[PDB]
């Protein structure tokens with residue numbers, strides 16, 4: 239039950255490593271999950287719905303990891319605090335590159351996918367701005383740009399930079415350099431006057 | 432001749448303000464340009480080719496403005512140098528929001544569009560890195576990150592941040608705040624230790 243659904247999701251994620259969603263059929267998904275095409279349609283209306291569920295799982299995985307981090311402070315410097323946080327996104331999305339790639343592409347065609355990304359990006363920006371605000375309140379960070387606006391640009395940078403690196407786009411920061419690159423820009427822009 | 436082509440391009444840019452390329456027909460383009468559908472096909476193979484040409488024009492307009500700026504230094508501080516430069520992109524793309532929007536979407540489906548963006552992003556990153564390198568050589572900027580890697584992330588930030596602002600995406604930096612936001616992050620990350 240859960241098992242056929244889990245199998246469909248696992249098949250989909252595995253096939254997306256090889257080709258885009260356009261080139262994967264419901265027949266491909268059913269076959270891989272060891273069910274028939276009508277049984278597939280019991281669990282999902284479309285292959286598009288399968289992607290949506292896979293992206294939902296990855297975005298929530300990231301969110302829950304960030305929640306964990308937020309509850310137990312690492313006893314470290316400010317640079318390290320930001321690094322550990324960005325690293326949640328690097329490792330989570332970077333562990334699901336095919337879903338990340340397909341999910342990004344689907345924003346163009348899917349209002350539900352567009353709204354899922356938007357919802358979580360708004361949450362992550364809000365959290366970012368709250369931490370900047372806390373750093374300012376304690377006297378560690380200068381009161382420069384509106385914290386929410388700075389947070390916004392820095393999160394959008396990470397979105398575009400991480401995903402270019404993962405996809406091997408030209409241009410991109412090599413994946414082995416992308417965490418240091420982002421952390422630098424975050425720390426200098428947050429603490430810099 | 433040039434005139435029918437120019438009319439087709441002008442019609443296309445005007446219709447893209449209203450609806451996406453998917454919802455614009457060759458018949459819509461021909462009618463607007465005051466030609467027949469077969470005469471259209473003399474000038475362009477597809478509506479997709481029309482977009483490609485419009486994007487080519489906008490990207491070259493930006494590039495040529497940056498070339499102009501690069502030839503005649505403004506007698507100003509370092510913050511202002513970066514601002515005037517970023518402003519070329521803000522004003523150029525911001526003056527062609529419908530083409531920018533459609534052109535960004537077309538990267539997913541069009542190898543030629545993907546390669547055009549890539550070509551010019553590589554040029555602009557290279558120029559950025561050259562200016563950072565010059566600032567370091569003169570002793571104004573510290574030798575922190577690899578200049579090309581820093582340049583890369585900052586250009587990708589601008590791409591994603593400007594285009595979210597222009598499209599009124601949620602989340603986005605308000606368009607009236609986006610230049611100050613980007614300039615802050617550029618100057619702090621380039622000059623910060």
Ligand SMILES: CC1CCN(C(=O)NCCCCc2ccccc2)CC1
Nearest residue numbers: 319320323324327366369393396397
């Ligand atoms: C789909 C996008 C979402 C945005 N991305 C991303 O890296 N955001 C990073 C947010 C870091 C939040 C944080 C602040 C302080 C301490 C710990 C954590 C990139 C991926």
Ligand SMILES: CC1CCN(C(=O)NCCCCc2ccccc2)CC1
Nearest residue numbers: 512513516517520559562586589590
């Ligand atoms: C499609 C993208 C391309 C990248 N974008 C963008 O703002 N790049 C800014 C490059 C600024 C180069 C410069 C350096 C120093 C002095 C003057 C100029 C955003 C739009």
